């Protein structure tokens, strides 16, 4: 279950342990409901839902976004697919659900996949036309990769306020529903029975999103003494949650960043820190009150930190970060038993180039991924997950050059950076401070680490020598 190929290029490791409910009450409700209809209504206000269609999802499918996508691509072209799904649809527009599957026969296949797609066809234009992106939110972040989320960091620090701080109930499912009456009354019936037979037993990103935007909207309208202790049993004068979202509720929202359920909130002052009563109410947190952050870089959101670097010409990037052992520990484990060489190279090989394009910073991932780069044969293609974030997009799963690929992601198509001249040499490429990279776990100036450093060149011509000597490798470290 280990991956060799990483294990025996990351020795200093070895000696690495970190490597090695009541319901909500009545007024609690009627503050869910108005500002979830708010929101609803404002995020539709620049879209319209629409169903998604049977070519959407073929498309999709063929692209995967193991042998089950050939599966898949077997069964989205069989005619008995999709009458098996028009068969379910009958039953979905009645308000029922019978042959979905949502947890090996092909007709179960065919109708687990079948309940994907009927999940896509009502509910898939919340991801297709980002109705959770920041320009349509304010507050979410949906589209955008690890690449850029520090960004997001860095513009709601410039926010005046105090610091920066970092389950759903079949009432939050109730007010998730309410996009619904924006739709027409077939689209409607068929959103309807995917929300309520999907809870009963990716959308639930969207809709997760959505819920939480809602909350930390409610808990800045507690924070600001909009809402009072009486309204957790019967909110008095609704009104005012009304005018409060009018004034205030974009200028909330942009001070949000919300994935899914994790979140970082710049309020307008520290009573947030304790706007803990509508919370706990609504099931979603202990009295502690919240503990802020000042430095928004130290502000963790999506597993990791962002820290503001500088090119030798003097351009920034916002790159992300997160504790050095959690990202060997993970390249340093394989999960497949069947423990292929090729496979566990070509896996070793996407964890070293994801961390040349996400965790470059990193003093001791650049020269292990450098060392991994140059152990494995370089026509050897990557295969594999590196990670489960959905901000990992998996532009390191390729055979480009990677600093073409940084290029691309940090400089080409990156809005934050207007200067577009290409950065044309790794050496250019900034590491974090040496006391930050210490700080986030570097081995740097560790004799052990030291002695690896020197002597990497053997260890990976030991590599080369099990993978074999015949295969075409390239040198990285020179
Ligand atoms: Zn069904
Ligand atoms: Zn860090």
Known sequence: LVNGVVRLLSKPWDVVTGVTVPDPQEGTRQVMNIVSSWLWKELGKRKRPRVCTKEEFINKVRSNAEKE??????????????????????????????????????????????????????????????WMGRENSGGGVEGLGLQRLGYILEEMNRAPGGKMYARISKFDLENEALITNQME???????????????????????????????????????EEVLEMQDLWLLRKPEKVTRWLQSNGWDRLKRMAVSGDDCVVKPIDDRFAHALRFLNDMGKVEWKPSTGWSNWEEVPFCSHHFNKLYLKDGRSIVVP??????????????????????????????????????????????????????????????????????????????????????????????????????????????????????????????????????????????????????????????
């Open 69 to 130: 996508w050939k599966t898949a691509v077997e069964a989205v072209n069989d005619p008995r697919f999709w009458a098996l799904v028009d068969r379910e649809r009958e039953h979905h527009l009645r308000g029922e659900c019978h042959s979905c599957v949502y947890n090996g026969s092909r007709a179960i296949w065919y109708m687990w996949l079948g309940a994907r797609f009927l999940e896509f066809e009502a509910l898939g234009f919340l991801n297709e036309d980002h």
């Open 185 to 223: 009354e077939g689209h409607r019936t068929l959103a309807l029975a995917v929300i309520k037979y999907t809870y009963q037993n990716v959308v639930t990103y969207a809709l997760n999103t959505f819920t939480n935007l809602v909350v930390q909207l409610i808990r800045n309208m507690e924070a």
């Open 321 to 478: 970060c997160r504790h050095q052992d959690e990202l060997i520990g993970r390249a340093r484990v394989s999960p497949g038993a069947g423990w292929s060489i090729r496979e566990t190279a070509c896996l070793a090989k996407s964890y070293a180039q994801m961390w040349q394009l996400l965790y470059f910073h990193r003093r001791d991932l650049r020269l292990m991924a450098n060392a991994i780069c140059s152990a494995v044969p370089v026509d050897w293609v990557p295969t594999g997950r590196t990670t489960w974030s959905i901000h990992g997009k998996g532009e390191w799963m390729t055979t480009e050059d990677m600093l073409m690929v940084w290029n691309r992601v940090w400089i080409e198509e990156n809005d934050h950076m207007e200067d577009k001249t290409p950065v044309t040499k790794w050496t250019d490429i900034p590491y974090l401070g040496k006391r930050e990279d210490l700080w986030c776990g570097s081995l740097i100036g560790h004799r052990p680490r030291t002695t690896w450093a020197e002597n990497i060149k053997d260890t990976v011509n030991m590599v080369r020598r099990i993978i074999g000597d015949e295969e075409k490798y390239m040198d990285y470290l020179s």
